[PDB]
């Protein structure tokens, strides 16, 4: 946010770090066109509603969230800062928010399970499928609250920036949950079964998908191209929203993410008809400023953000907001 | 408007009350889009009809006004000329054209309503009911011929301008009404119930809230985004006009804000149906240039433009104009 | 054309020449508006067809030409060019290209027509009746075959280039037909009985007003928002055109002008539905370069620009170019 | 490919030799046309599928190809490289990949074929019919497997930047096939009974040409505006791509070229239905590096990247990628 939030995140960051975080796939046109597609959007506000009380909680996978909103899995978040994972679980923990626990997080999900809070827990297909269903069980007997099983990864985008970069992981960060393979639906079920947490899969686009994944059981999915990083000319998951919402009829959460960068962000998803959004690139910016303290301060600007533009907008509560309409500009 | 007027307010003021005037909420995209918004709308003019006669005179809330126009409400006028409301509220009146008094005035309303012409009078709703329905009743009172009930504002917008340059009401420029809480549909009927002035709600921009301010008895509305100050990401009012003309059919006067920078803009938003526009900003720019002569020189060539521009459609009267048809561009 | 045209105009003429060419009315937005909205049409090329006798040629007015483009009306061409309005109708006749005679010529109408060719006359209606038919008695009986009844100028559009240049008709130019006020439809008729010509209301931009050309008894329209001179923020013609073109259902010859600058252009209004084109700035470019030959050289250009389109179209006449397909990019 | 590509071309050739291999016709409108359409298309993505067996293969015209891609016609290849036709004939026979020899080579046809691989023939009709069939039969007796019969050339589009540049054929630069007239119908009807092969309509941007080819015979069209060096303001084939599949039915294959840039803009082409690309003006930039190896990295990049998007778009074969959906972007 506040630009200086990603400038100052300019300036601490080696390049090619900041490189890793920023970039997209290909010629990076899905992660413009997320940006794009969120600033074409126009809500339509009501007015004169009761807004004594305000409130910007949801339910989700059975408990309450102070906002609509995760935090993203992004991996190795020792790059950012050396308390990495710790210093953003925390916050997220003290802001009500969920934070989702990566396959690949630079601290064991363990430890960052045992920060408390509300902790997802991102899951990679690993070419051993008991292998995937260990990191499962491990995330289910953590604590973890939903298994956030990524599926628009059977291999990961080509990235310019860090082959131009010739980037690679630093010797100090490690994968500290190891001591991969394409996920298929018959991998979904195997997740499924063997957990009775809420299987949310993540990097849905089309609408058939969405249906399926209702079909096949899960709880939630999150409607995303993986931030630009995957299929260069994916469609923005804020474009495909509200067809998918439609399809889904409220068979299970709906999440969005791609470049949301304010609470008015927030409310546009929202509005779109989505349950809840994830923020990834945003939430590393502020980790280059005080864990517990830099990432509390997003939060806090971001709850304040979302219950403004609620308000402006003329709704009591997150359902209120869903039911706005929009209008595309151009 | 000519550009030079904006500019040489750009230079008269200092750096932070011109921003205070200029600037719009958030990222200010619904400030721009207003004047995106108007860009896109081409006029299709109407040919060889007999202009012997052309006048831009309407009739609203029971008075001729000499234009499709009245000065919008623009709190602390005197942040931008020692005369404030009183330099402003005389060239209206000498132009024909009705002045809104804020209830933010820098002057009492008793004292711009002494000033003559076609005041009208902006509420803001107060934490208590009885000073509202108390200002309402001395505007009333005073001479004023309309309230136009603010309702788009249950708490002000985050101006990001404002926050970044510290700005605060310099101690020379109160509030000289007084010696605030979110207005509900109920807070309408109060008013309504208070007053025989038409009431106008000021800051509607969806359809359903148009047909509701009918229902609960509105004279009028001004479909608004608060000139982009408010809600950040709302729709322009010039996007949602054309269908709260349909929806109101006719049930009240349906006015238009946002952007309007010539008679060209006015004619474009009479041939969306508005029954009359707003003009803000660029009567404070005026306003820097001499008063009873700065603002009617704007006045002047303002209702010039509107008498050039309806002529070109082939519009004798306002009327005509709002049965042009527009093609919206790119 | 070939931009050097228009600079090496923008360099001989003085800047307040220039300005009064190339300029529009308010802030120009149908002046660039015209250059947009021919950019956005793409033509359906046919192949495979014989081309074997390929012609740009015409039937107008009882008439053939050359092109399915004639010299459109621009006053007082002595600003331009010593030689002025007689240089271009040399070159268009010699071009087999109809040349519009200005009611405001710097040459008598009678001496421009005595150049031979196919010249038609632009009626300005004079305050005086009898004074607007003697000009159009005039012209037929100097053998004019067309009066061009211009119909969107019940005034002059304000142009901020010219009021900004303080410009004024240097002395040495005059209005040699002589030695205003708005017209109606009366005033159509008034022309229609009083010659046997073929009168063209130039100026029409709304459907309605195409059908009551025709119903009036029109020979043809221009539908032209006079080169964004007029009106500002009049829609383009280009845009109206395949509407008026079906409204009038072959009732009249349908014109096109406003930012005609290549042969593909011609193309592109015919494939929308045009009869022909006017060129208007680009003829006065070409005027300060060589008259029976500067706006030879320029006719000639066009001529192997439309022959060149026309045929890669699969055009083998100019009512095959009509049939063409088109689609609208962005 | 990878600008440098481009930029690497940039400076070894000749500016003028640059020129005439980027530029199109006239303002080079539907040059940029290309670009932007694929541009504007955004893919929907599928998950989860099986990627075990993830193939780029097709079979076209009986023959399997390792990629849905075929070398454009590209004349006088020695003009960028002194191996010219071999060096680019020799990577496309390693990379599995069609090569399409044109009438205007720069080494005879009989040699290009002897490279092997699939060589394919372009065919410029000549003003004497015999010379045609005679060419025809030629490049059949060489082994050429299609005869690609290029429409859209009645004769060659206007290059204003090779007029400007004043540009001729180098004198060491030959047609090596030889030691020209518009093509119809009846040319195409020739042809096909001239030959058992396949004959392939280039140059296919209507509808009714499309449809028209499957009547006639045609075993595939290339949909394409001959990047933009024919018609200016031809409709990008891109644009018209999805529906001449549709008008086709399967009765030929459907292949489009322009723009193709990367494996993402091959993907959004056989998402909208292609069954095939053709790659022009890159191959010619790669040939600035390496022949049977400068070529040849270019098309296993272009391979690389295929397979890339092809599985994060969830297909597993290129007919899969077909039946993917696409959504227009702005
Ligand atoms: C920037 C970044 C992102 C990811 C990662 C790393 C980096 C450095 N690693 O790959 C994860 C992972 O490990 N698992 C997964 O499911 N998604 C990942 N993502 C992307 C994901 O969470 C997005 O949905 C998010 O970026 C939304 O967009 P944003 O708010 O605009 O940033
Ligand atoms: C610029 C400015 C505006 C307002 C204010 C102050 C400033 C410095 N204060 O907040 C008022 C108020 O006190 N009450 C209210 O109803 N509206 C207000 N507005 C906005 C309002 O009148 C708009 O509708 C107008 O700006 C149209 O757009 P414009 O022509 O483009 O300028
Ligand atoms: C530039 C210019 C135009 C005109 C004039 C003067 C100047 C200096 N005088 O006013 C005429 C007149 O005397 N009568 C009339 O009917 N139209 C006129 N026009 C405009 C008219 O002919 C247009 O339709 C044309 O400009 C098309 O556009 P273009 O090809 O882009 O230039
Ligand atoms: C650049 C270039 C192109 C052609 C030629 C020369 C040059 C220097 N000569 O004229 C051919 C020919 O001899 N025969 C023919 O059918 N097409 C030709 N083309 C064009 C053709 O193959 C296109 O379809 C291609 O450019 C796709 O676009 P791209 O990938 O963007 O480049
Ligand atoms: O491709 C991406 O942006 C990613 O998701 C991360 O690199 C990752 O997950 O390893
Ligand atoms: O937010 C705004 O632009 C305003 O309306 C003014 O600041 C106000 O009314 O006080
Ligand atoms: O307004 C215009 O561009 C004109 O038509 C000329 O100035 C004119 O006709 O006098
Ligand atoms: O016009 C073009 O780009 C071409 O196709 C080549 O110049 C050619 O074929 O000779």
Not at 66 to 77: D, I, N, T, W
Request: charge should be negative; glycine fraction near 10%.
């Amino acid at each position: 946010s506040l630009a200086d939030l990603e400038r100052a995140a300019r300036d601490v960051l080696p390049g090619e770090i900041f490189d890793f975080l920023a970039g997209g796939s290909g010629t990076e046109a899905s992660l413009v066109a997320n940006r794009t597609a969120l600033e074409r959007v126009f809500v339509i506000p009501r007015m004169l509603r009761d807004l004594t009380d305000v409130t910007t909680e949801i339910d989700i996978f059975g408990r309450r969230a102070a906002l609509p909103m995760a935090v993203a899995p992004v991996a190795y978040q020792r790059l950012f800062h050396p308390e990495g994972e710790l210093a953003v679980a925390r916050a997220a923990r003290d802001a009500g928010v969920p934070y989702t626990i990566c396959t690949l997080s630079s601290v064991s999900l363990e430890e960052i399970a045992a920060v408390g809070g509300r902790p997802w827990f991102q899951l990679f297909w690993l070419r051993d499928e008991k292998r995937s269903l260990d990191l499962v069980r491990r995330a289910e007997d953590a604590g973890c609250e939903a298994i956030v099983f990524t599926v628009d990864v059977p291999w990961m985008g080509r990235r310019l920036r860090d082959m131009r970069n010739g980037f690679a992981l630093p010797e100090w960060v490690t994968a500290a949950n190891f001591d991969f393979a394409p996920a298929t639906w018959e991998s979904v079920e195997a997740v499924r079964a063997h957990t009775d947490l809420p299987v949310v899969l993540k990097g849905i686009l089309a609408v058939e998908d969405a249906r399926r994944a209702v079909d096949a059981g899960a709880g939630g999915i999150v409607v995303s191209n993986h931030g630009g990083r995957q299929l260069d000319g994916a469609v923005p998951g804020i474009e495909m929203l509200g067809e998918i919402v439609a399809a889904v009829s409220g068979g299970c959460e709906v999440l969005v993410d791609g470049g949301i960068r304010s609470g008015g962000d927030v409310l546009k998803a929202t509005a779109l008809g989505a349950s809840a959004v994830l923020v990834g690139r945003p939430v590393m910016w502020a980790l280059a400023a005080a864990g517990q303290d830099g990432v509390r301060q997003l939060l806090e600007l971001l709850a304040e953000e979302v219950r403004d533009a609620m308000g402006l907008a003329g709704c009591e509560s997150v359902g209120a907001a869903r039911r706005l309409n929009t209008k595309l500009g151009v």
